[PDB]
Design a protein around this ligand. Structure first.
Ligand SMILES: [Zn+2]
Length: 79
C-alpha cells in the first residue's frame, strides 16, 4: 500500500490540503527514453524568479519510480 501511494515523502501536494492554487507548476516537457517503454517528464515552477525544478520519471503504465526536486521556495502560499 505504501509503495502504491506515499512512497515518496516529498510530494507536490500535501494532504491535498490546498486553499486554492497555492502552488503553480508548469510542465517543462516530455521525453522518451529507451523507446516508448520508458519516458521522462520535466516540471518547473510557474512563478517567476524561481529556480525550483521538479523531475518525474514514468514508465509503461505511468507511475513514478524516481522523483527529483531542486531549489527552495520563499513563498509557500500565493501572495
Ligand atoms: Zn516558486
Amino acid at each position: 500500500m505504501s509503495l502504491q501511494s506515499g512512497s515518496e515523502g516529498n510530494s507536490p501536494f500535501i494532504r491535498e490540503k490546498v486553499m486554492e492554487d497555492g502552488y503553480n507548476w508548469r510542465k517543462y516537457g516530455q521525453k522518451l527514453v529507451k523507446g516508448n517503454e520508458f519516458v521522462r517528464s520535466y516540471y518547473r515552477c510557474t512563478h517567476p524568479n524561481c529556480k525550483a525544478k521538479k523531475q518525474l520519471e514514468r514508465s509503461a503504465g505511468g507511475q513514478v519510480v524516481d522523483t527529483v526536486y531542486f531549489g527552495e521556495h520563499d513563498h509557500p502560499k500565493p501572495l
